[PDB]
Amino acid sequence: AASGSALIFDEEMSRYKLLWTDPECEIEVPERLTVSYEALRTHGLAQRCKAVPVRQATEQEILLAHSEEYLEAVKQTPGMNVEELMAFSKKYNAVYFHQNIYHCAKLAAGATLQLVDSVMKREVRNGMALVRPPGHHSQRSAANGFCVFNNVAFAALYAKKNYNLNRILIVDWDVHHGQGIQYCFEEDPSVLYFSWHRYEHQSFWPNLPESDYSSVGKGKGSGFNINLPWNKVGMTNSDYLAAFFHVLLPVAYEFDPELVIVSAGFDSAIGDPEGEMCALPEIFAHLTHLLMPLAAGKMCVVLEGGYNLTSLGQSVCQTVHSLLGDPTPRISGLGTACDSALESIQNVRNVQSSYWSSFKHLAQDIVWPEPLKRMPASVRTVVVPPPGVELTLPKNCQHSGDISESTAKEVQRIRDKHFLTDQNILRSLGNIISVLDRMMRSDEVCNGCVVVSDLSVSVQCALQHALTEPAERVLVVYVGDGELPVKTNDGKVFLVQICTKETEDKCVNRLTLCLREGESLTAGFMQALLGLILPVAYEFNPALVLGIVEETLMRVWGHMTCLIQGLARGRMLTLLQGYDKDLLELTVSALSGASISPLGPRAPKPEDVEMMEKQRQRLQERWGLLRCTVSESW
Ligand SMILES: CN1CCc2c(c3ccccc3n2Cc2ccc(C(=O)NO)cc2)C1
Ligand SMILES: [K+]
Ligand SMILES: [K+]
Numbered sequence: 242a243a244s245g246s247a248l249i250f251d252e253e254m255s256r257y258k259l260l261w262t263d264p265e266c267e268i269e270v271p272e273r274l275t276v277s278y279e280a281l282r283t284h285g286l287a288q289r290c291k292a293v294p295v296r297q298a299t300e301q302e303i304l305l306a307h308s309e310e311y312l313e314a315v316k317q318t319p320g321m322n323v324e325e326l327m328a329f330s331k332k333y334n335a336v337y338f339h340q341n342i343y344h345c346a347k348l349a350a351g352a353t354l355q356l357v358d359s360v361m362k363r364e365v366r367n368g369m370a371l372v373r374p375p376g377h378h379s380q381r382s383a384a385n386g387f388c389v390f391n392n393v394a395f396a397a398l399y400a401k402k403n404y405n406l407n408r409i410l411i412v413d414w415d416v417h418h419g420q421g422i423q424y425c426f427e428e429d430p431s432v433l434y435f436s437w438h439r440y441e442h443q444s445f446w447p448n449l450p451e452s453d454y455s456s457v458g459k460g461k462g463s464g465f466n467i468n469l470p471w472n473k474v475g476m477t478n479s480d481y482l483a484a485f486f487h488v489l490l491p492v493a494y495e496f497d498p499e500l501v502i503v504s505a506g507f508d509s510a511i512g513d514p515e516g517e518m519c520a521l522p523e524i525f526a527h528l529t530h531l532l533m534p535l536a537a538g539k540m541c542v543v544l545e546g547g548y549n550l551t552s553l554g555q556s557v558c559q560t561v562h563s564l565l566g567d568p569t570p571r572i573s574g575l576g577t578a579c580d581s582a583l584e585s586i587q588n589v590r591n592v593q594s595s596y597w598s599s600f601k602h603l604a605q606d607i608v609w610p611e612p613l614k615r616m617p618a619s620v621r622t623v624v625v626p627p628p629g630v631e632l633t634l635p636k637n638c639q640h641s642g643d644i645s646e647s648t649a650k651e652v653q654r655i656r657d658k659h660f661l662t663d664q665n666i667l668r669s670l671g672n673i674i675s676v677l678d679r680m681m682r683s684d685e686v687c688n689g690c691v692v693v694s695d696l697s698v699s700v701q702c703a704l705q706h707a708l709t710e711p712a713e714r715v716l717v718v719y720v721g722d723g724e725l726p727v728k729t730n731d732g733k734v735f736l737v738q739i740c741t742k743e744t745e746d747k748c749v750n751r752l753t754l755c756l757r758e759g760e761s762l763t764a765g766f767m768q769a770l771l772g773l774i775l776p777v778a779y780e781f782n783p784a785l786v787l788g789i790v791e792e793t794l795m796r797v798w799g800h801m802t803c804l805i806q807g808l809a810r811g812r813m814l815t816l817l818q819g820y821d822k823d824l825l826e827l828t829v830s831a832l833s834g835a836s837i838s839p840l841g842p843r844a845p846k847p848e849d850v851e852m853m854e855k856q857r858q859r860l861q862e863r864w865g866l867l868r869c870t871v872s873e874s875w
C-alpha cells in the first residue's frame with residue numbers, strides 16, 4: 242500500500258508576470274509560488290515530501306481538453322512583443338499573457354499530470370502541485386481569469402483515459418466558480434464537480450447565471466454538478482464546514498470516487514482581497530482531512546488562486562500537513578452557518594434531492610492569530626492487546642504494557658477508593674492511565690487502543706483520568722446497548738451512542754442512534770456520521786475522544802475512526818471489549834493514519850432517516866452546526 246506525499250514545484254513557473262498596468266490582474270504574481278514553497282520549506286514540510294519533477298504537457302495531452310485552434314493561437318504567444326501580447330490578452334476576459342506563459346502553462350499542466358501518475362501508480366499516497374498559471378477558469382477555446390489551460394480538467398480526463406477510472410470527484414474550494422471545469426464535465430456522470438464560490442446573486446465575477454445552485458449538470462450528467470453560491474462575503478469556518486457536512490461529504494461518500502482532485506484555491510481564506518471571506522487557514526487542514534478517507538486516500542491537490550501572500554503560505558502548509566498525516570488543529574468557536582449560507586445550502590440540497598435521495602425533505606490590513614505548530618507524534622499509536630498476544634504493527638505503532646511505579650500507585654489509589662482484585666483488569670487500568678498520560682501530557686504519542694475486559698470500570702477510569710489530565714471536554718463515542726458510568730450534566734462530556742434498542746433522549750448533551758437491522762445499516766451509519774455526529778463533535782470541540790465498543794455493523798469503524806481524528810488534535814483512546822483480531826487491526830490501522838478501504842455501494846431505511854432527522858430537530862437549537870435550513874423566525 243502506497244505511502245508518502247508528492248510535492249511538485251518548479252521555479253520556472255514563477256518566470257512570467259504582468260507586463261502592463263492593470264489593477265485588476267496585478268494580484269497574480271510570481272511571488273505566490275515562491276512564498277508558498279518557502280513557507281513549506283520553513284516549516285519542514287517540503288523536506289518530508291517526495292519531490293517529483295515537473296514536465297511539459299504534450300500537444301496530445303492538451304488536446305484532451307482544448308481545441309486545436311486555441312492551442313495553435315496560444316503557441317504563437319512566445320513570439321509576441323508586449324504590444325502584441327496585450328492585444329492578444331484583450332481577446333479574452335481577466336487574463337494576461339507573457340512571452341513565457343505558454344511554456345509555464347504546459348509546465349503547470351504537466352506538473353498536474355505527474356501528480357496524477359504518482360498517485361495512481363501507488364508511488365505516493367497523495368500529493369500537491371504548486372503551479373502557475375491556475376487552470377479552473379480556462380475553457381475548450383478560451384483563456385479566462387488568469388488561466389490558460391485547465392490543469393484540473395486535464396487531470397480528470399487523463400486519469401479517465403489512462404487508468405480507465407469510472408468515478409472521479411473534483412472539489413473546487415477556490416473562492417471563484419470554476420466554470421471551465423463545469424462546462425468540461427457537465428454531461429459526464431463519471432466526473433462529479435463540486436464548487437463553492439463567491440456569487441452575491443450573480444453580481445460577483447464571472448457573473449454567470451449557470452454558477453447558481455440550479456445548474457445540476459445536463460443529460461446523463463444531471464446531478465453530477467453541484468454549485469454552492471455564497472451570496473454574502475465574510476463566510477466563516479462554520480459556513481465552510483456546514484457546506485461539507487450537509488452538501489459535499491454526503492454526496493462524495495455515496496458517489497465513492499476512485500480518485501479525488503482538489504482545485505485548491507486559497508483565495509477562500511481570510512485576508513484575501515478577492516474572496517473577502519473569513520475562514521482561517523486551519524480550516525484547510527480539515528477540508529483536506531475530511532476528504533482523505535475517499536478513494537483509499539488517493540488525493541491530488543492542485544493550486545488554483547490565493548493572493549494574500551500570508552494566508553496563502555499558511556493555508557498551503559495546513560493542507561500539506563494533513564496530506565502528510567500530521568494531527569489536525571483544533572477549531573474553536575464553531576456554531577450555526579449564517580442565514581445566507583443556510584439559504585444556499587437548503588437550496589442546493591433541494592434541487593439535488595432528485596439525484597441524491599439523502600437530500601429529500603418531507604413536506605410541510607487584515608490580521609488573524611498565527612496558526613499553532615502541527616507536529617506528528619514520536620510514535621503515533623500505542624496498542625495494548627490482551628496479555629500474551631503478539632501482533633504485526635504498522636511501523637508508526639507500538640506496544641505499551643509497561644506500567645510505571647507512578648501509575649501503579651494511582652491504580653491502587655483508585656482501587657481502594659471506588660472498587661476489586663482481578664489483577665487483569667487492574668493491569669488494563671494501568672495501561673489506560675499510561676496511554677492517556679502519554680497522549681495528553683506529551684507530544685510523544687498521538688492516540689491509542691486498549692483491549693479491555695470489564696467495561697464499566699475501564700470507562701470510568703479512562704473518563705475520570707482524562708478530565709484531570711486536564712481535558713476540559715471529552716467526546717465519548719460508544720457502540721453498545723448498555724448504560725455507561727458517564728455523566729453528561731455539566732457540559733464537559735458529550736455522549737454519542739449507537740445501539741439497537743430505541744431509548745428516548747432527554748437532554749442535549751447526548752445523541753443516541755438506534756439504526757434498524759439489515760443491509761441498510763451501513764449507509765444509515767455513514768449518513769448519521771456526516772450529518773449528525775461530525776457537526777456536533779466539531780462544535781463541541783473536545784480535547785480527547787473516547788471510543789468504546791462492547792463485545793456484543795462495524796464495516797464503518799475505520800471511517801469513523803479516521804474522520805473523528807479531526808477532533809482533539811487526533812487524540813483518541815479506543816477501548817475494545819473482548820479480543821477481536823480483525824476489529825483490533827482495523828482500529829489500529831485507522832488510528833495510525835493508514836488508508837481506509839472504500840465502502841462501495843444500499844440506501845438507508847426511511848425509519849432510519851426519520852430517526853436521524855428527529856435527532857437533528859431535537860439538537861440543532863443547541864448545536865447550530867447541525868442546521869441545513871434557515872430557521873423559522875417567530
Ligand atoms: C474583481 N472581479 C473578480 C476578479 C477579476 C475581475 C476582473 C475584471 C477584469 C480583469 C481581471 C479581473 N479579475 C481577476 C481575477 C482574480 C482572481 C481569480 C481567481 O482566483 N480565480 O480562481 C481570477 C481572476 C472581476
Ligand atoms: K470554487
Ligand atoms: K459532471
Ligand SMILES: [Zn+2]
Nearest residue numbers: 415417506546
Ligand atoms: Zn480564485
